[PDB]
């Protein structure tokens, strides 16, 4: 099966979510050596804001698109196709300014596509991604899960994933990382324990 | 006083939030002809993703910055300064894929600045923007305020605004816009009634 490994942290080697997302993927490869991994670093190679141009490009026939429109259309196509092909997705999801990074939301905007990851039916919208397994690697400076301050982060992500039909979701969490070295170390240690004994 | 008018819709003349944000500002000008308006269309002139480069530029002395770093630093400075100067802010805030547009969040990332719009104290973080009035123009295809599906939209915005100390907040809402022409028309009519009789 195909595993898509997504990072969105802007903090590079100092990133908690990049460390933990890599650790989930390493654990996964060890548990299933046949897994095929595709990597996408949404911070290193940022996806353009979903724009009026994105919409115009989508509604313009390929043979009449200019270069900028071909760019937007290919960006939309390649991102969507990579997600559709994936059987499992590991997503690094920092909390920056009370929500996810715009680098991550820009990816979400390309994968939330009517007719592909969800569809409209006479009975209402139906998610089409129910076969996909997702591991969300959720990292934050504070501890606000289950509280209003956390609305834009895990709650939002759960809404999006639920809408496209994901039912098989695990959250690997390391929160309170800004409260000092000992608290940061334990939060990461606990997340590693989840990876080691509660994922596979 | 200085009013900052922000739009983030990608739908141009078909935008509900651009129509209503303009109507709030027109009403404001009529109520207070001395108000000075500054406009920023975050969709037409999109702010770069808040990135590793943004952080590096901020920590690099001006005299050693290269051109790309001067760009990031000026973008950060001009956006922040415009917000600090504003006494009132009218913000067009569509719901796209269960949250705000990345164009709007990229602005939030430049205005959430320690020491400027909030500060760390020995007693915890304190918002510094309590004198500012904000009118949020909230538009959505569905009706999900007060429900989990709405977490990434108004709930998130209220968290951000509360953190930087905004207490004087009004929300002008037009939701259910995707459910048909009559429902869209009434939602906009109700929002116009709020503007006419419940804002000023
Ligand atoms: C630009 C920026 C914004 C942040 N905003 C928040 C925030 O709103 N709430 C919070 O709890 N932590 C916040 N943090 C702390 C991060 O959530 C924390 O450092 C986490 O480890 C980020 O994941 P990462 O290390 O993989 O980048 C922010 C950090 C940065 C760099
Ligand atoms: C790319 C895109 C994504 C959208 N996602 C949502 C959504 O998640 N939930 C919703 O209720 N409406 C959604 N809508 C509908 C918009 O919220 C609605 O059209 C609203 O009027 C947008 O504000 P605007 O007209 O100022 O652009 C979406 C519209 C677009 C174009």
UniProtKB/Swiss-Prot annotation, chains A, B:
Keywords: Flavoprotein, FMN, NAD, Oxidoreductase. Its cofactor is FMN. It catalyses: 2 a quinone + NADH + H(+) = 2 a 1,4-benzosemiquinone + NAD(+); N,N-dimethyl-1,4-phenylenediamine + anthranilate + 2 NAD(+) = 2-(4-dimethylaminophenyl)diazenylbenzoate + 2 NADH + 2 H(+). The keyword Iron does not apply. It comes from Pseudomonas putida (strain ATCC 47054 / DSM 6125 / CFBP 8728 / NCIMB 11950 / KT2440). This is FMN-dependent NADH:quinone oxidoreductase 1. Homodimer. The keyword NAD applies. Belongs to the azoreductase type 1 family. Its EC number is 1.6.5.-, 1.7.1.17. Coiled coil: none annotated.
